[PDB]
């Protein structure tokens, strides 16, 4: 419980959902091919931390959508905000959903981190 009548933001964001795929090519159990790192300063914000999509798997659930892109600032995930949190905390928030999930990222925004692997 938080929003009711219309839940839009003042800034341009892209609210896309991620559906879970039943079997494909794995034998462990992951929380969608979506990775986001928290406790990272935002480019522009007044010395504030947030969460951004570290990277995206090769043709995963996140990439499946097409919208979601690497180096994108995630405003909120599954409703739960990641801003003003920590990598771990965030992760936990993310790594905790058996099935489709909802992500709230910003449109006009690019972090671009030194992510090799």
Curated annotation (Swiss-Prot):
State where the protein is found: Presynaptic active zone
Q: How would you summarize where this protein is expressed among tissues?
A: Moderately expressed in the developing cerebral cortex.
Where does the PDZ domain lie?
Answer: 15-109
Q: What does this protein do?
A: Scaffold protein of the presynaptic cytomatrix at the active zone (CAZ) which is the place in the synapse where neurotransmitter is released. After synthesis, participates in the formation of Golgi-derived membranous organelles termed Piccolo-Bassoon transport vesicles (PTVs) that are transported along axons to sites of nascent synaptic contacts. At the presynaptic active zone, regulates the spatial organization of synaptic vesicle cluster, the protein complexes that execute membrane fusion and compensatory endocytosis.
Subunit: Interacts with BSN, ERC2/CAST1, RIMS1 and UNC13A. Interacts (via C-terminus) with TRIO (via N-terminus). Interacts with CTBP1. Interacts with SIAH1; this interaction negatively regulates SIAH1 E3 ligase activity. Directly interacts with GIT1 and GIT2.
**Involvement in disease:** Pontocerebellar hypoplasia 3: A form of pontocerebellar hypoplasia, a disorder characterized by structural defects of the pons and cerebellum. Brain MRI shows an abnormally small cerebellum and brainstem, decreased cerebral white matter, and a thin corpus callosum. PCH3 features include seizures, short stature, optic atrophy, progressive microcephaly, severe developmental delay.
Domains: entry comment? C2 domain 1 is involved in binding calcium and phospholipids. Calcium binds with low affinity but with high specificity and induces a large conformational change.
What name does the UniProt record give this protein?
A: Protein piccolo
Give the organism the record lists: Homo sapiens
Q: Identify the gene encoding this protein.
A: PCLO
The part of the entire sequence present here spans 4489 to 4592 of 5142
